[PDB]
Amino acid sequence: LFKYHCNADTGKLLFLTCQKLCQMLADNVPVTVPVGLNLPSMIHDLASQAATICSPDFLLDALELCKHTLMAVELSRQCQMDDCGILMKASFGTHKDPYEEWSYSDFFSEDGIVLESQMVLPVIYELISSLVPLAESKRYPLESTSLPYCSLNEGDGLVLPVINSISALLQNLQESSQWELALRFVVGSFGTCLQHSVSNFMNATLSEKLFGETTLVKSRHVVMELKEKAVIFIRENATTLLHKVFNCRLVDLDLALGYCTLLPQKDVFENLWKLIDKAWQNYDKILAISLVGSELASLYQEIEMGLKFRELSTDAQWGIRLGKLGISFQPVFRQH
Amino acid sequence: LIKNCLVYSIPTNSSKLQQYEEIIQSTEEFENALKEMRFLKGDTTDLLKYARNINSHFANKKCQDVIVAARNLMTSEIHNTVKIIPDSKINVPELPTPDEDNKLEVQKVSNTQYHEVMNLEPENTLDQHSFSLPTCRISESVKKLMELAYQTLLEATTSSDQCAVQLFYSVRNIFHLFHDVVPTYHKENLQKLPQLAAIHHNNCMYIAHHLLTLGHQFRLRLAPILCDGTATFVDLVPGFRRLGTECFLAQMRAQKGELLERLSSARNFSNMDDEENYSAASKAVRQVLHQLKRLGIVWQDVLPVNIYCKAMGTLLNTAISEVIGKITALEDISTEDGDRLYSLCKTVMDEGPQVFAPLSEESKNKKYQEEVPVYVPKWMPFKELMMMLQASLQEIGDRWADGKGPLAAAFSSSEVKALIRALFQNTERRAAALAKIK
Amino acid sequence: YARNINSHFANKKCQDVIVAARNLMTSEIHNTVKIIPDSKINVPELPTP
């Protein structure tokens, strides 16, 4: 149908099929998967095909489904999986890859504790079912099921179980050292949770006559509390990710610069100097830190710190040059 | 009534929201009268429940007109390319500067007069090649999408917080939609056209480069709900790279799956005395170079200089290491074979470096055409095997250099012994040479 | 060769405008631009008498 009957009805049918597949996987029903086809990959491809040619009314729901099927596929890729063939990730780091290691090794990668699949997929697919409810009824224009019309009474809300579902997976990802994934799953979930309360309740003059004032106060309190949790979590995620990035042999400066922007304004450089105080064991790490510090100082329009970072970079370069030979640069390094 | 009257009455600006209140009131009386006239049975109908949803009906509009405008310019089959200069990058229309109340601590800094600083220029240097964007050809759709995202972000700064948050997450949704629409829609054209794979790789490395600094450029101008670190774009950076890499290598393995097939007529490079075995061997070698010539012409001035040269070296390494393996697995090489094998090797060295064309001007090509061994790692072994094909036994012994010469570093001792046995006949001189080689 | 400076002039001015053409004609990169019937490219201001 996708090959011969490209239209809105085919997109709706594909969206319904992808919706039902996630519900069937969430209910722990053992279904014989043909050998040679990845199941989360096929769910994500069906979602993408539904989103490409769907009508403008179904575009938001298909996009919301696609945002999360990719996350499920990425979670599955970190787990050893069968029924498709061999999908063991450790088979990649056991030997050197000829084709890949000039377009992959230039970018940062993280290899932590292997994730067990029995705790990942059932939770995430139940989350997908919760976020995108089964919709078959007539859709009036400008309506959806991921940015819905609902009331938030004392204990009434679809976000409450979603918060617990996210919290269950978050602590699991913490102990498995999957910080690269954890940042993305925190940000994507926090955006949807913030939208679920923002999409209705900050037009105060119009909201009071339709929902009352107490519901507005409750939403205002809940948003602040969730934001306070997220702010504290993001800082702890970013610090550890920054620590782990620089420990590599070929440090990815481009990604380290992006990770530095998450921390608050004044406390980045203060950390960086601490990072240069755990330094001087290797001059290459010092040069890598100095380049990032100079670039971030230039981006922050901080001229004063740029001179110090450039002097440190020059000292690191001279130290490397002398370390190529037998000359030691230790006694005078980082002095006037 | 819903699909013809209430849909178009929804305002597009947050300032006109309050004026919608009458429509909520005016509907209710229209609901009440039909209840007094017994045209209805219950109390709440779908005509009134739609009117009370004007909150969501606002957002679900502002969050789709910026999305549909994206997907409209994403499914177009017309392809265009624009060159990106590293120095000139697209900037936002003038950034929202803060109020003058924070200039009290600024004017106290811009009051110092210095002349000892401009008289001294520090000689400190930096490796700035690791923080710029190399020259490439990006699709015009990606550039237009980036400019639309910049305009949306600029517009979000001059409105209420609801609109700012909705527009920011709609900008996030634009890239989320990009990550899934282009690979699915262009599935046919990412397998048969080598240029489109490079174009897609360049688009991904452009978007990933911009996403790193996109978050910081609006950190202190949005609502305080998004001014502390939650509003960012770093999380998507690792994904796009994986989107831009796996698509490109899928073109590589498709190309390799041709070269080896074109070598299937090599007949294991045996019995070169036969004229048919020489003709069928030349047929493979001409076509192997011809495929790479056309591929390099296609990829010319599309990929950046480093990646183009590396991919070409990688393809040529697979092209050469198969011929090397075929030659080193032979058993009988006569005087006639030692001439024709050298003749086949001659074309590869004559037209090997001539395939590289990383730029458009001919003068700039020869600079990179002379650094082939830096990119191709198995170039030295093929050069050595060349000059061994007609070297004398005593010359081979000299060039072995007791395990310290170029031939020793090129191949292994057992490999040299096997090649000598395949080259030279059973003579006491051959035995002495084998005794020379450890 | 020195006495041929007449032709050596023309054969230059008549090739630098030709090679610049064939340079932009054998490029494998394809681009498309839409043509509006109302707006057509005009010469820089015409030489008036």
Residues of C with Cβ-Cβ distance to B360 under 8 angstroms: 27
Best to test chain B binding among A73, A202, A219 (most B CBs inside 10 Å): A202
CB contact under 8 A, C28 and B80: no
B81, B297, B298 member nearest C31 (Cβ)? B81
Residues of B with Cβ-Cβ distance to A212 under 8 angstroms: none
CB contact under 8 A, A187 and B71: no
Following CA atoms B162, B167, B170, B172 in sequence, which dihedral angle do they give, to the nearest 10 degrees?
-110
Contact A195, B165 (CB under 8 A): yes
Best to test chain A binding among B5, B18, B23, B60 (most A CBs inside 10 Å): B60
Contact A190, A230 (CB under 8 A): yes
Cβ of B189 under 8 Å from any chain C Cβ? no
Between CA A78 and CA A80 the distance in angstroms is 7
Record the tokens describing residue A62, joined without a space.
């298909």
Q: Do chains C and B touch (3 or more CB pairs under 8 A)?
A: yes
Residues of B with Cβ-Cβ distance to C31 under 8 angstroms: 80-81
For residue B136, what are the β-bridge partners? B84
Burial (CB count within 10 angstroms: exposed 0-12, middle 13-18, buried 19+), residue B78 = exposed
Residues of A with Cβ-Cβ distance to B230 under 8 angstroms: 187, 190, 227, 230-231, 234
* Residues within 8 A of A (CB atoms), B 3-32 only: 3, 7, 10, 14, 17-18, 20-21, 24
DSSP per residue, C7-47: HHHHHHHTTHHHHHHHHTTS----------SS-----SS--
Contact B200, B218 (CB under 8 A): no
Between CA B388 and CA B395 the distance in angstroms is 9
Residues of B with Cβ-Cβ distance to A48 under 8 angstroms: 180-181, 183-184
* Residues within 8 A of C (CB atoms), B 342-361 only: 360
Following CA atoms C13, C14, C17, C21 in sequence, which dihedral angle do they give, to the nearest 10 degrees?
-160
Record the tokens describing residue B427, joined without a space.
């003579």
Q: How many helices (H) and strands (E) does chain A have?
A: 13, 0
Please list, in sequence order, all residues whose beta carbon lies within 8 angstroms of the beta carbon of residue A184, skipping any fewer than 6 positions away: A71, B235, B236, B238, B239
Between CA B260 and CA B278 the distance in angstroms is 18
Record the tokens describing residue A300, joined without a space.
């922050």
CB contact under 8 A, C29 and B137: yes
Q: Which of B434, B410, B414, B415 is nearest to B424 (CA)?
A: B434
Residue carrying structure tokens 């990802």: A173
**How many A/B residue pairs have CB atoms within 8 Å?**
194
C-alpha triplet B309, B311, B314: angle, nearest 5°: 110
- Characterize B346-379 residue by residue with b for buried, 16 or more Cβ atoms within 10 angstroms of its Cβ, and e for exposed: eebeeebbebbbbbeeeeebeebeeebeebbebb
User: What CATH number does residue B297 fall under?
Assistant: 1.10.357.150
Backbone angles phi, psi at A151, to 5 degrees: -100, 150
Cβ of B129 under 8 Å from any chain A Cβ? no
Contact B289, B355 (CB under 8 A): yes
Between CA A312 and CA A319 the distance in angstroms is 10
| Method used to obtain the model | cryo-EM
Q: What is the resolution of this structure in A?
A: 3.9
Record the tokens describing residue B112, joined without a space.
């110092």
Contact A6, A35 (CB under 8 A): no
C-alpha triplet B163, B164, B165: angle, nearest 5°: 95
- SS3 label, residue A208: helix
Q: What is the 3-state secondary structure (H, E, C) of chain B?
A: CHHHHHCCCCCCCHHHCHHHHHHHHHHHHHHHHHHHCCCCCCCCCHHHHHHCCHHHHHHHHHCCHHHHHHHHCCCCCCCCEEEECCCCCCCCCCCCCCCHHHHHHCCCCCCCCCCCCCCCCCCCCCCHHHCCCCCEEEEHHHHHHHHHHHHHHHHHCCCCHHHHHHHHHHHHHHHHHHHHHHHHHCCCCCCCCHHHHHHHHHHHHHHHHHHHHHCHHHCCCCCCCCCCCCCCCHHHHHHHHHHHHHHHHHHHHHHHHHHHHHCHHHHHHCCCCCHHHHHHHHHHHHHHHHHHHHHHHHHCCCCCHHHHHHHHHHHHHHHHHHHHHHHHCCCCCCHHHHHHHHHHHHHHHHHCCCCCCCCCCHHHHHHHHCCHHHHCCCHHHHHHHHHHCCCCHHHHHHHHCCCCCHHHHHCCHHHHHHHHHHHCCCCHHHHHHHHHCC
B80, B298, B360 member nearest C31 (Cβ)? B80
C-alpha pair distances (Å), B156 with each of A243, B162, B165? 34, 9, 8
Q: Which of B371, B373, B375 is nearest to B384 (CA)?
A: B373
* Residues within 8 A of B (CB atoms), C 18-47 only: 27-32
Residues of B with Cβ-Cβ distance to A207 under 8 angstroms: 55
Contact B176, A66 (CB under 8 A): yes
* Residues within 8 A of A (CB atoms), B 359-418 only: none
Contact A252, A245 (CB under 8 A): yes
Residue carrying structure tokens 């400190």: B124
Maximal CA-CA distance, chain A: 80
- In sign, the C-alpha dihedral spanning B278, B283, B288, B294 is positive
Following CA atoms A51, A52, A54, A59 in sequence, which dihedral angle do they give, to the nearest 10 degrees?
50
Residues making up chain C, counted from first to last: 49
Record the tokens describing residue A236, joined without a space.
């702890």
Between CA A192 and CA A95 the distance in angstroms is 40
Residues of A with Cβ-Cβ distance to B212 under 8 angstroms: 254-255, 257-258, 261
Between CA B320 and CA B348 the distance in angstroms is 9
Q: Which of A120, A128, A125 is nearest to A62 (CA)?
A: A128
C-alpha triplet B420, B425, B427: angle, nearest 5°: 105
Q: Can you give the residue range of the structural domain that contains B283? A: 247-436
CB contact under 8 A, B180 and A47: yes
CB contact under 8 A, C28 and B78: no
Best to test chain B binding among C23, C27, C29 (most B CBs inside 10 Å): C29
- Kindly state the helix (H) or strand (E) to which residue A241 belongs, with its residue range: helix A214-246
C-alpha pair distances (Å), A300 with each of A274, A304, A306, B326, C25? 19, 11, 10, 59, 46
Residues of B with Cβ-Cβ distance to A319 under 8 angstroms: none
Q: Which of A57, A79, A177, A93 is nearest to A123 (CA)?
A: A79
Following CA atoms A258, A259, A260, A263 in sequence, which dihedral angle do they give, to the nearest 10 degrees?
130
C-alpha pair distances (Å), A65 with each of A25, A50, B289? 15, 10, 47
Q: Do chains A and C touch (3 or more CB pairs under 8 A)?
A: no
Contact B245, B201 (CB under 8 A): yes
Closest chain B C-alpha to C28 CA, distance in angstroms: 7
Between CA A125 and CA A23 the distance in angstroms is 7
- In sign, the C-alpha dihedral spanning A17, A18, A24, A30 is positive
C-alpha triplet C16, C21, C26: angle, nearest 5°: 130
At position B43, the amino acid (one-letter code) is D
Between CA B36 and CA A212 the distance in angstroms is 28
